Amino acid sequence: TELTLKPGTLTLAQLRAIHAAPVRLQLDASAAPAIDASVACVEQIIAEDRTAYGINTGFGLLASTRIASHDLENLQRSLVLSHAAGIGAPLDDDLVRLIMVLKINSLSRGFSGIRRKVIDALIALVNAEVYPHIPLKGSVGDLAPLAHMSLVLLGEGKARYKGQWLSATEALAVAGLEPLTLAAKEGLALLNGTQASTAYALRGLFYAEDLYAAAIACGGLSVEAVLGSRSPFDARIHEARGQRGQIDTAACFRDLLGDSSEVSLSHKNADKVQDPYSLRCQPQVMGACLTQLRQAAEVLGIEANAVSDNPLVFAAEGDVISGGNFHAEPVAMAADNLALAIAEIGSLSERRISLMMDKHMSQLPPFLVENGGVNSGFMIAQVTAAALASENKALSHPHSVDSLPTSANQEDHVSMAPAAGKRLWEMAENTRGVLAIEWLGACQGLDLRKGLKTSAKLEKARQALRSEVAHYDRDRFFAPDIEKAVELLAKGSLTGLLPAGVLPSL
Amino acid sequence: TELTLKPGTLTLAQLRAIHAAPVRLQLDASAAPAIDASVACVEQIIAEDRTAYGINTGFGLLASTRIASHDLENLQRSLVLSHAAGIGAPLDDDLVRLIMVLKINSLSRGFSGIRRKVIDALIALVNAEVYPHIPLKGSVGDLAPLAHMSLVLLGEGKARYKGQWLSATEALAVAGLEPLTLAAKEGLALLNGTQASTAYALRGLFYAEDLYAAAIACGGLSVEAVLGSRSPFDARIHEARGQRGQIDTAACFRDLLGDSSEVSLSHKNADKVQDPYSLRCQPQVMGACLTQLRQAAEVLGIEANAVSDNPLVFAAEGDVISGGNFHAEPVAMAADNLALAIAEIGSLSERRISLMMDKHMSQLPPFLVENGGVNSGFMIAQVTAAALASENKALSHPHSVDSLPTSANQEDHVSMAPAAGKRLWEMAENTRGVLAIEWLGACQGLDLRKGLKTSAKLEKARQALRSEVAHYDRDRFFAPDIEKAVELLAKGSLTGLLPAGVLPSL
Amino acid sequence: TELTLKPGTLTLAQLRAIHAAPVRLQLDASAAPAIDASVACVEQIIAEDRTAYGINTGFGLLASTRIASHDLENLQRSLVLSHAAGIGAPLDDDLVRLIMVLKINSLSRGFSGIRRKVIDALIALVNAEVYPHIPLKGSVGDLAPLAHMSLVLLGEGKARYKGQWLSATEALAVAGLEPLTLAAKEGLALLNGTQASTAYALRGLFYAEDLYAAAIACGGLSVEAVLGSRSPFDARIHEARGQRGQIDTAACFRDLLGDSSEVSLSHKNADKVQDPYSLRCQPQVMGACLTQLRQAAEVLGIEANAVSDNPLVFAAEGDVISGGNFHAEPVAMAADNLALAIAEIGSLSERRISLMMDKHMSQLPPFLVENGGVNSGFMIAQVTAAALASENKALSHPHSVDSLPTSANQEDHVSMAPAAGKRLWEMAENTRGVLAIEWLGACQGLDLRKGLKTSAKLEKARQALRSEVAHYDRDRFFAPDIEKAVELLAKGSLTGLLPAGVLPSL
Amino acid sequence: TELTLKPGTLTLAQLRAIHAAPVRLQLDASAAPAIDASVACVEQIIAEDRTAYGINTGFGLLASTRIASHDLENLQRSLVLSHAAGIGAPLDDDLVRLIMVLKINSLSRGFSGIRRKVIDALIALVNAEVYPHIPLKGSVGDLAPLAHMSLVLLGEGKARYKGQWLSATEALAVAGLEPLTLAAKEGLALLNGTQASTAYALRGLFYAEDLYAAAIACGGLSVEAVLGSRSPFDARIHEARGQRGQIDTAACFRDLLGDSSEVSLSHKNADKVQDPYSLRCQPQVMGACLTQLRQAAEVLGIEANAVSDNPLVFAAEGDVISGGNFHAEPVAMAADNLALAIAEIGSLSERRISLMMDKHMSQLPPFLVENGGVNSGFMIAQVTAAALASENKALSHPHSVDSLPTSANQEDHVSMAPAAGKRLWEMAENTRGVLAIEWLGACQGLDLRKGLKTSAKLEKARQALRSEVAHYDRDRFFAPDIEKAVELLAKGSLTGLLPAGVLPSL
User: What is the disulfide pattern of this chain (chains A, B, C, D)?
Assistant: First the structure.
């Protein structure tokens, strides 16, 4: 993607694209005025020998002590070095890229007092596909990960280029840069903010959306496999409840299923025995999940565009004000909200798998295999789905309700947004595995309705899976089939079946 | 309140009023057409000897077995009796009233096929202030509590009138009624639905709103008590982040605090040392809480108006359709969302109490008492606040992520909405106790700034507390002071200070 | 019970008896030496004008400031008054009695420096059945509840006698007492300690034990009702695993079931189809629960006898030492351990109920009723059991992992033991309701095996229930049957069937 | 380690050694009788044309259908292939080795009916250091991971040798083996069992023990750094409480600290101001943790030796019995117990870090650095410790309280032991990072007490860290210091300071 960025206007679709693939960006000309004007306000404070906390002061004893020039340049470097105190595995380059772009976006709104040259150095790194090392853990909601990113600007730390670690000076040279020296306010502008928290949660959102889309297709396949009814999806039921998420979800099921299929007609008014809730309550459960993800997306899409550093520079009035926008509470809650959605998408899918395995409910052979007292079929795949779904219950415990006071009680309440967002990634792996197993089971069950077809889009879902995984004719090593179905889901194989304009970023 | 109900149009303010106090209601004339038309559709199915699941069938063996008249009347009674299988403490009358009104509202939209006479019998009970016994527990999201309510219509169960338990026949007579006999579809119309789940969560919402309002006033008092700054509330900071909850929250703080007060001016540019986050990040944390409660309120206000029984009768087309609107998933998630807000309101307040107790941070005597090596002052009240805030972490664990399959796997996924909503009530007691202690502490600390006043609305908060609880001059039995402050908060003493149009139902 | 107490030697059976019913106690003569000797050590410090923290110092500025006599008497009173800062519902008298006896026991070990006269005043209150008001909440693990108890000794607060609240002076007079004045160290000896935390957790233990016992009988009934096998209980299986809890649990099942019964013989080698895990894995699951409760009981039985105040007086060496025995961490963990046991007893029972409702698994009519397309039978009782079991998952979240720093970070890590123990009470109500429903279902199912009997002890369980609740012949109001079964379980109706010497306190 | 295994007698020290490093094992001669005798019992059933579930039956339709020879060999292979349905990252070789040895141990007790040749093939793989691929996820407590392990015996799947993946036939050849054909009962003997669950939890135990040991040394360093007292560790305090974990923990602190040190003497009766609980309540909190880990270790050490497959063969009586020993409930609870210990070790350490950063409490410069309004020192390392400690609260939510019914409700209650154990690994990473930061901080703080030494063993802890990480003289890139301290802890640098015979496996 090639982006001429109007700061503060990134959409969720643009954020998904940044998360998914490399970007080339530059600032729109309209960004220059406010960026340069907050720098000029900082420069005027210094030229006028005024003292402003977080501009030309120290910290602590010196918090309203105007320290001298000399000390102030070095102070920026000391802040980045000492604050780069994170730990844990390195983030992958896609996430590092997203964090860098979010930081560029926020700074480029012109309230932070950082030189346009420093912003353009971050842009050069993005454009060169040079990604600073950022460790996963340490932020309480994002001094440490943002300090690690910023090290490379100073010629410290390391960065990844074409999958290999480079020294910061080699990495800068790849991007056409040499090490920079920071000025007043720039250490705080780079280190204070919510961009790591927000990126972690946005990744969770995009995963939740991918899983929602796949679950509409998988659930439609499972309805067909067990001769379920389309009547639960009737628009009038959903209008009468009035829940938007459910209305839009039922509309997606109707789009994928259509009014009837060869399978449904071949079993006619089938419906003589009411469907289980894991089928018939899909609009209600998946709709609640959709509302939850939309809740979270609204908060996260704002936060991606937020001015989140401190103190803020209001050049139009000539004011520098210390507030609290670095506190990532809304991000932490958005991530905890997303956990409910990822968990319940998986729970409902796991119950549909269980239904398909139950001969009294599925109208299929037990465990979806012919010769069933000699073959186990899908029996243990169903157990794997149970294990994955169960893990998500404990993982749903909220992080936004915890806090510890850091630094002699001044940092006396924090968000825990990073932990909240990061756990969504593993929840999403769990739900993706459940859905992969459901996909496998429903395609197997439809195969056993010999020669019959489902709807146009659900046949595309069958064809996608059968390109890699064969019908289960007799017991064979099961796990490679699950692995392949998971990889197809992770690559977005089913996402394009969902109607446009339903999910926040799609 | 006197209400001429247009079904499906209840507002959150009206729901708060129903929850708070008795009501007298009647249906608007415009409700009659659809109510009577879905009854006529049911009557036409029976007159035409057609068979329709959930109208004139049995269940199970007989699910598409048109059973005879005789059996069908008795079947309604057998359903109510057998389904009234709840357990636990009786609900209070305010909550029973809310459940009854929600059921009236939903049925009166005309999609359920229940006689207007049966709806008007529920209305007569409400109007007579006769409240069926409903036990707290048993629903998985609301057959059992709604069956208990419905017993009284049949002359079974018991009901409360002027605080005393009456037999159902005495209770009906108070309301001008005699026992009714139910018709086709009416047992399911009464028992299926989400009204208990929704009422439990609405009570949680109203509590969360009450606590939000009180926390703006308490936090403003604490800012003043410790000589905190107003600069964190500056509108430009909040506009620059762009989070609506935070913008509106900072506007509330500015309204209550004003630009300056005698206390703030008497300590002038005070601000020489940055405020702790529990003060300066109030817009960010309380704003995240406000967004969360607004999230939940949107879902709950829709659900209060929802058609939530099954099967639904679409008289305009002549269709009866079985779906899943009884599944309370969105309510369960809304309640889990509210838990985050109630917990974090309390956590932030508890940190402000801790700040006030800390002589290095408060600019007040340790533990808010004079003669402090002989007097303990607020030391153990602060511990009580810690205990209450801590309990809310475990209580925040979500219920919406659990389910058990009931009835031979047909009821194979449920919401757990009742448990999700009910736990909010105790969370709210915990946060109310924390805020009561904060109120006490900040008024004590302001008293120690001898003769100085805070802003107009915050002085009203001081006066409200000091009408019941004196300045703490020397150690005395502490707990009665906490009890009185809690009761004042529970009665809404501080709610009217908040600007109108901020909280969903206010 | 009449007890001549050798301090520090209370057994779990004695603690159960104290919890269950009134007591009359006196100290054994052998207690006097150490009690009076630690008082004499305190008196010698004061006579020698020495200074000892927590004996004759203030707190804070004065922590190693020997304050004068005068101030020291008043200081004790100020501590009790200011520390009585709890909130919430009053504890019931049984729990208050247990707390008082635990405090008597701990102080009477002679390490606390409190006059024997003050200990004997607490004993007089117990013996007179006069129970101070103690509010439920406020301790973080037990200054506030122990301060509330202690108020009555000073003629403050209130106390319950024959179910009515009395002023402290009337309450003291009932016990033959007049208000006391405390001496050096006595305020801390009364207020510091773990007795409320320990009592809350002991109540949880006793409930868990009661539920374990009832669950062996209910599970044996359910095995019989569905024609399950006795082979899973064979001692050789359990010896081969080697887990003690499971060995002892299987021995209990064999004792209650016997080698065969009329029902089992009438269905002979029945066993042709393997039993579900909720039957066949009872030794494994219930055994894990038994080990967990034994874990907790070992810790709690020690803590009931612990010296838990501070500073401690070692009269034999002449030393007063400040440590940390008031920290209730081990109690908090014991309570969290008990939560796992209470939850899993309930989960396994709920699955046995579900099995009995499933015609494909139970060999009984669906929902345990004859005429089943017209009668719903136990269908909604099973839903109530699901709701109760589900609630226990969230309630199992541990409290021992939380802490907040109280009082300017000196009280910088606390246990949250009170919250951990108290939540067990509601978990136990939930599991008791599940077991009540299982009891009802299995007796109903056995009735449907017309004229057949189970084993001697399981017939006693049937007779106990059928004395209050009839066979379910046709749909009727269900809930009163659940209520009666719960009350029978709460009264210990099934406990006496379990072999002696299995459960810690039984 | 070279082991002549007496089955069923492995100690926790031996299990630690197996987990830590390669092993060479053979069975003791005394193992042969029972192994061969249960095979002969299986052979006698087949020779006698008897039918025995799980020996010579099918499953399902055929569960008491004696299927023919032919089908029975192939049935073993079909079970392994179809059951190898796990997903997720491959286990590391140390854990695979532990699982293999636990399976060898359990089978070699002679109750499973599997040929000694098959056991010796697993032994050959261990001895050759050839480790089957086992994916992390899928078991609900261990068909799938044990099926994956077993694939390699049949010449399927893959195995790791010298860090590289080999085909199963190459891997077998490395071990001197060719593919095997399984006999009656052998597929179930290999696949049923608790060895993966038990290995996952044992790894958690060993980590918890390593962290306990490191935390005694780190906490002793922190006591010294802030001039804390040794009086809290006095044996008489701990004897008077009577909790064993606390007694043994205080004895460990006394051993490492000694009666006095140069630092403690140089500050003399220092003690004039009481230490915070994070120091003075170390015996109480760490002792509760020790009891918890000992609880868990007792259960896990039994389970490592358990006969956990099914059905079991009792050759002495000639009986084959189906029970439930594959249900890993006790392991799941042991793992949840360990979570409390790992969490609270980390919480207490994080509070000691916070104490060291607080100039009002530490008697050290703020943030442990000289020149502190220009240098940030340990400020953000402390934030990293807060983040890690906080994550452990949510991760402590129990898995043993969840279950889903798998396979048409026969598998109707499961343990979730694998998830319970696996999450301990990440909890341990979190607590290890906290302790690494504490180690760094306390060594820095002691350095600032110029030229003074602590005790003999605590100086060894200082020397170990200072071999890799220098004194923090001025701000520098912080994170590499944390990384090095974590690696030293992970390698057991501090474990050998703890007295022997305290921790279960040490």
Answer: none
